[PDB]
Structure formats: C-alpha cells, structure tokens
Amino acid sequence: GAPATVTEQGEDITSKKDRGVLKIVKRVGNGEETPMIGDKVYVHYKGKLSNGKKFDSSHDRNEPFVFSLGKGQVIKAWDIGVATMKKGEICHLLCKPEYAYGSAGSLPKIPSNATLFFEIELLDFKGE
Ligand code: NA
C-alpha cells in the first residue's frame, strides 16, 4: 500500500541524507514557489501509524491545520517536508521517529519509537 511504497520508493529529502524523511509527490502543485521560513502554512493531512491505524486527520475536522513554517511548531519531518511543497501539491511523507516523536511518543495514540506516514496537501502559504 501507500506506506510501503513511500518506504521503498520515496526520495530522501533530509539535508543529512539519513533516510529519515522520505517523500513522494502524488499531485503536482502550482508553479515553482515553495513557502518561506516563517510563512503561515495551511495544510490538510491524514496520519497513519505503522500498524495501519489512523491517528489524526484534519479532513475529519473540516478545517485545515495552520502553523508557522520552520519554527519547530510541528515535528521536524513536517518543517522539512512542507518546505519542499508547492501550493496545491499533495505528497506522502514517511517519517522515522528521529524526525517525529522519538522515544517519547505522543499521547493518546502515537507510541514510542514510531515511524509515521502522512498524506499532506499544501493548501496555501502566506507571509506576514
Ligand atoms: Na503507489
């Protein structure tokens, strides 16, 4: 399925080239521009654990998730991955725990040492 495919066929987008964040572009976005550090980014996403369980979805809340890019307001894999996206792009990210929640995990649903799969849509980005 999609998590296996990004694991085996994804692109390493880390600057360390340690395979910690792998990406596949699923829907090509608009133009060439990617968001800049500090931009307000608006995303829709779904996240799955490596046991197949959905742990989160913004679609199910009928509102996007909004954060300031590159500020550590989200897991490292998202700061790195969203920074590569064009407006309107949909991608898959496969995130090793060192770029996610590490040994701590995140209650209620994310265990220790968890590799995470996300589908992410970059809806918009805006500077301030
Ligand atoms: Na595929």
Ligand code: NA
């Ligand atoms: Na891209």
